[PDB]
Amino acid sequence: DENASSEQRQELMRSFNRDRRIFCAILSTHSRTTGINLVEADTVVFYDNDLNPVMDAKAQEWCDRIGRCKDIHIYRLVSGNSIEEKLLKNGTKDLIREVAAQGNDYSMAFLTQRTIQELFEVYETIAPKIARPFIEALKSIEYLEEDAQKPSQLEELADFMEQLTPIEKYALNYLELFHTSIEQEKERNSEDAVMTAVRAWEFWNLKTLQEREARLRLEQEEAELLTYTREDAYSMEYVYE
Amino acid sequence: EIECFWSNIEQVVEIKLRVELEEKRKKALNLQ
Amino acid sequence: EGEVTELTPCETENPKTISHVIIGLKTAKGTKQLKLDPSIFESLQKERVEAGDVIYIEAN
Amino acid sequence: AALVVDNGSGMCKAGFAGDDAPRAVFPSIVGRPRHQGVMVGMGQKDSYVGDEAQSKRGILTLKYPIEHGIVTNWDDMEKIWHHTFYNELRVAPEEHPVLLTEAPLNPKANREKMTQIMFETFNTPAMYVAIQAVLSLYASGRTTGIVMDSGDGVTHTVPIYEGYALPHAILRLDLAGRDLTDYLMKILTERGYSFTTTAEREIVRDIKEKLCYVALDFEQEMATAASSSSLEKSYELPDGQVITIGNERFRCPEALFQPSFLGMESCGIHETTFNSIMKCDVDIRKDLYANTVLSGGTTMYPGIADRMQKEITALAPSTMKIKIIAPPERKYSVWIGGSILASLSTFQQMWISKQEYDESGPSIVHRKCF
Amino acid sequence: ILSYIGSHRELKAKRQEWAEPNSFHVCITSYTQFFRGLTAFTRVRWKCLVIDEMQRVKGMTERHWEAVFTLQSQQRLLLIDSPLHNTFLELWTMVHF
Amino acid sequence: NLRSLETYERLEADKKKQVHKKRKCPGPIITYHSVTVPLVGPPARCSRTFITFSDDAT
């Protein structure tokens, strides 16, 4: 949103581009998108249309900037049988042109009954100077709704770097010098080795269990019993019924 | 445990490089 | 079911790793060794089974 | 803080765990007066150690207690340890644990003798023994690979898997900085510069350390030196005489790759490394080729890493990724690795306590150190 | 690539590397730093001069154009994204460029 | 330059190696593991369990 600082905006966009798992990024059209250069997304959905022509133009230009590297599909959601269909058809350009013809004071302008009927009967580029009072009207309305509701990072790292032990500082210098060794991890396609090792182990286990069964057979070939208790020999009489 | 130590130091190096890159980008933007 | 005579785990290399838990059970008829699944080690320590303890193990 | 002592054949490095460099580095030498009778009467010490012995080399007989990485004189080694603790570190060994380094294939009897000396003579509270090559690997942030360690008296190639050295694949080469210094002395005598004294031997060592380098192509470098004098460099002797050194700059270190220069039938360091890797399991050879770390003072020659890379690429299969790692501070890799190991919180439970030694004897070192 | 960005001390250090043959192949600098260091750029024999989005640089005076014309370069390239206004001054300046 | 450029473009390798780590925090660990293994005398397969202990003490 616009309340996220520029550094936060860059951090969040870099995180979105880096983490391929994030499925959607939701952005405010009023956020200064002009600070986001690269977007690794191929689909843009406009939930609602901005009434400010300058902001709509900025959003369109931004969507065009992303499309320089890949084909993009842009979807505009519009509520049928609502004012949104008319605002999609003609935007605010005709309204601003009509009000500008009556003068520079938008607070005292009156709209023609035909325009009102065309907008509300539900079933050439405008320069920013001409749109400014309209934008100030929009701002005024938004603020009225709001009234209805109503040490540098480098110095921090320097303090942190000063708390590191000498061996940690050496490790820092070593990793900085070996900039070509950021791939120190032995990442390899372990799956193939696992696929072969599983079969080799299954065979080893089959062999070991066969040898165990053979040893048990040898142990059973040996005599099982050679002695019996004194009670069975003399203290009891064997009977059959 | 050694790999864990070196991974932590690698993350610290990443953070330092990121802050220095952001400082350089801010200097490049301010000079205009 | 039977009196436990041994609870030796079977160490192995993973393709300390155990692949089986051998339990020896003794009854008045005889003795049998079972190549039980290694996961039974949790239940053995939960039940505090020791050598010389009579136990029973359901097949399912 | 635990003490880390690197027992090197040529130099001993000692310091406190957690530091980035050893605090004391001095030659591992003990000197005794040549003529006892005259000089004992004047209160002179019976023996000198380290830098004091080296400064009095004109009147002392110098002996190395460690030969080719193996301790041969236990009395002199004990004297070196005493000198280190009381003169170099100026600490009471009874109050600080001490970590000691050992050469590959160190005899069990030597480890037991070291443990006995550390517990009975210095009354150390705890001790640990670590393999020099293993510490060298630790100093580079790696745990699986092969370390080619070439010190002052011996060169070893040690393949290591997840921190464990593979004894069956360890190879030993009795060629190091001292043999190279003697070879440089011989070839300088062949050019006309005569060095016969121990002081002149140390001058030749300084010349070797300051002017020698490893040529990428030995034949091309020899042709360039025979066709142009652009490779000749001048060295000012302590007496002011300036000597000119030509092809000797790269012919001397070439003996490491071609031991035939000294009449030795052994394989070079690159061939030794290749043979050591070939003795390991096929599944780990890929990790060994990508994690070949150079360590030791004899590996400080400029260009040695490139030559090693070229030779291994020519010897290894074309499908294998070859990467030679040569840390800038590789001469202290052993001590740095020991300092890292002794600084870990989990390692504090791996120290051999005096109680454990009293209960199990010196054999506990074999069941606690790897 | 030579990014000609920095303080006067860093720019002096970068200029100290100009004397080495083959030190850099392409030099990138800003318009402000380009005009501020015009004396330094005239001492180098540039193979190709590229000017990008110059139409967006506010304050391009006739003296800036004279400064651009005084550079000895073998080839000059101008990159524009908008059509020229075809004014006499603009066309005369384009001819001189 | 590629290593320099990777300061911006190395979004893939570094993130993959930092996230998909094959190890965890120090201390004793008991790993229950169960994989498909092929039967011996889709293919015929059976399930097998391994239990791994970090240290001899546990």
Q: Does A2 touch chain B (CB under 8 A)?
A: no
Same domain, D281 and D148: yes
| D299 and D168 share one domain | yes
CA F56 to each of CA A183, D169, D329, D363, F52: distance values in angstroms, whole numbers, following the listed order:
33, 27, 37, 20, 11
Last residue of a domain, one of D211, D244, D266: D266
D245 DSSP β-pair partners: D233
Reduced to 3 states (helix: H, G, I; strand: E, B; else coil), residue C30 is coil
Question: Which domain CATH number covers D122?
Answer: 3.30.420.40
Distance from the Cα of F30 to chain B's closest Cα (Å) equals: 18
Alpha-carbon span D21 to D19, nearest angstrom: 6
Q: Which residue of B has its CA nearest to E32?
A: B32
**Rounded to an integer, what distance in angstroms lies between the CA atom of residue F58 and that of residue F56?**
6
User: What φ, ψ does residue F5 adopt, rounded to 5°?
Assistant: -65, -35
Residue in D115, D104, D198, D114 with CA at minimum distance from that of residue D151: D104
Pull the structure tokens for residue D26: 């001095």
Coil/strand/helix, residue F15: helix
Burial of C45 (0-12, 13-18, 19+ CB in 10 A): exposed
Handedness of CA D156, D157, D163, D169 (dihedral sign): negative
User: Is the four-CA dihedral A193, A194, A195, A197 of positive or negative sign?
Assistant: positive
Domain match, D100 and D153 both:
no
HSE-CB at E72 with a 13 A cutoff on CA atoms is: 6
* Pair D258, D327 in one domain: no
- D278/D159 Cα distance (integer angstroms): 10
Contacts of F33 in chain C (CB under 8 A): 14
* Residue B3 token pair: 């790999």
Q: Write the CB contacts of A122 (distance below 8 Å, at least 6 apart in sequence).
A: A81, A82, A83
Chains B and D touch (3+ CB pairs under 8 A): yes
Is there contact between D and E if contact means ≥3 C-beta pairs under 8 Å?
A: no
Identify whether residues D1 and D93 lie together within a single domain.
yes
Of the partner residues D143, D341, D346, the one whose CB lies closest to the CB of residue B3:
D143
Q: Is D23 on the interface with A (CB under 8 A)?
A: no
End position of a domain, from candidates D266, D282, D316:
D266
Q: Which of D94, D95, D169, D83 is nearest to D133 (CA)?
A: D169
**Same domain, residue pair D74 and D211:** no
Verify that D23 and D118 share a domain, yes or no. yes
Say how far apart CA A133 and CA A91 lie, in whole Å.
Answer: 17
What count of other Cβ atoms lies within 10 Å of the Cβ of residue A160? Answer: 12
Q: Measuring CA to CA, which residue among B3, B4, B14 is closest to residue D145?
A: B3
- Residues of chain B with Cβ-Cβ distance to A10 below 8 Å are 22
User: Where in the sequence is the domain holding D366, given as residue range(s)?
Assistant: 1-132+334-370
**CA–CA separation, E24 vs E3, rounded Å?**
10
Residue in the structure block whose two tokens are 């000692």: D14
Four-residue CA torsion sign, D76, D81, D86, D89: positive
Question: Do D232 and D207 fall into the same domain?
Answer: yes
From D266, D293, D314, give the residue that closes a domain.
Answer: D266
Reference A20, options A42, A36, A35; nearest CA is: A42
Q: Which of residues 26-85 of E touch B (CB under 8 A)?
A: 30, 32-33
Distance of CA B17 to the CA centre of its chain: 2
> According to the 3-state scheme, what is the secondary structure of chain A?
CCCCCHHHHHHHHHHHHHCCCCCCCCCCCCCCHHHCCCCCCCEEEECCCCCCHHHHHHHHHHHHHHCCCCCCEEEECCCCCCHHHHHHHHCCHHHHHHHHHCCCCHHHCCCCHHHHHHHHCCCCCCCHHHHHHHHHHHHHHHHHHHHHHCCCHHHHHHHHHHCCCHHHHHHHHHHHHCHHHCCCCCCCCHHHHHHHHHHHHHHHHHHHHHHHHHHHHHHHHCCCCCCCCHHHHCCCCCCCC
Q: Does B23 contact A157 at a Cβ distance shorter than 8 Å? A: no
Q: Which residues in chain A are closer than 8 Å to B6, comparing Cβ atoms?
A: 171, 175, 184
Is chain D in touch with chain A: ≥3 Cβ pairs within 8 A? yes
D292 near A CB under 8 A: no
Q: Please give the tally of structural domains in chain D.
A: 3
Instruction: Give the experimental resolution in Å.
Output: 3.4
End-to-end CA distance of chain C: 14
Interface residue B15 vs chain F (CB under 8 A)? no
* Per-residue 3-state assignment (H helix, E strand, C coil) for chain D: CCEEEEECCCEEEEEECCCCCCCEEEECCEEEECCHHHHHCCCCCCCEECHHHHHCCCCEEEECCEECCEECCHHHHHHHHHHHHHHHCCCCHHHCCEEEEECCCCCHHHHHHHHHHHHHCCCCCEEEEEEHHHHHHHHCCCCCEEEEEECCCCEEEEEEECCEECHHHCEEECCCHHHHHHHHHHHHHHHCCCCCCHHHHHHHHHHHHHHCCCCCCHHHHHHHHHHCCCCCEEEECCCCCEEEECCHHHHHHHHHHCHHHHCCCCCCHHHHHHHHHHCCCHHHHHHHHCCEEEECHHHCCCCHHHHHHHHHHHHCCCCCCCCEECCCCHHHHHHHHHHHHHHCCHHHHCCEEHHHHHHHCCCHHHHHCC
CB contact under 8 A, B14 and F14: yes
Q: Count of CB atoms within 10 A of residue E26's CB?
A: 10
Please identify which residue in the block is written with the tokens 């390239």: E77
* Residues D228 and D363 grouped into a single domain: no
Query: Nearest Cα to E97, choosing from E61, E69, E64, E56?
Result: E69
d(C-alpha D21, C-alpha D337), whole Å: 10
Please check whether residues D7 and D103 belong to one and the same domain.
yes
Task: Tell me, yes or no, whether D214 and D238 share the same domain.
Answer: yes
Interatomic CA distance for residues D117 and D75, integer angstroms: 10
Distances D354 to D29, D81, D101, D348, D362 between C-alpha atoms, Å: 29, 19, 19, 14, 10
If asked whether residues D55 and D170 sit together in one domain, one would say no
CATH value at residue D229? 3.90.640.10
For the sheet containing D11-16, what is the strand order? D24-27, D11-16, D3-7, D98-102, D126-131, D352-353
| Planar angle of CA D64, D68, D71, nearest 5 degrees | 55
User: D285, D273, D171, D99: which is closest to A188 by C-alpha?
Assistant: D285
Distance CA D20, CA E37 (A): 44
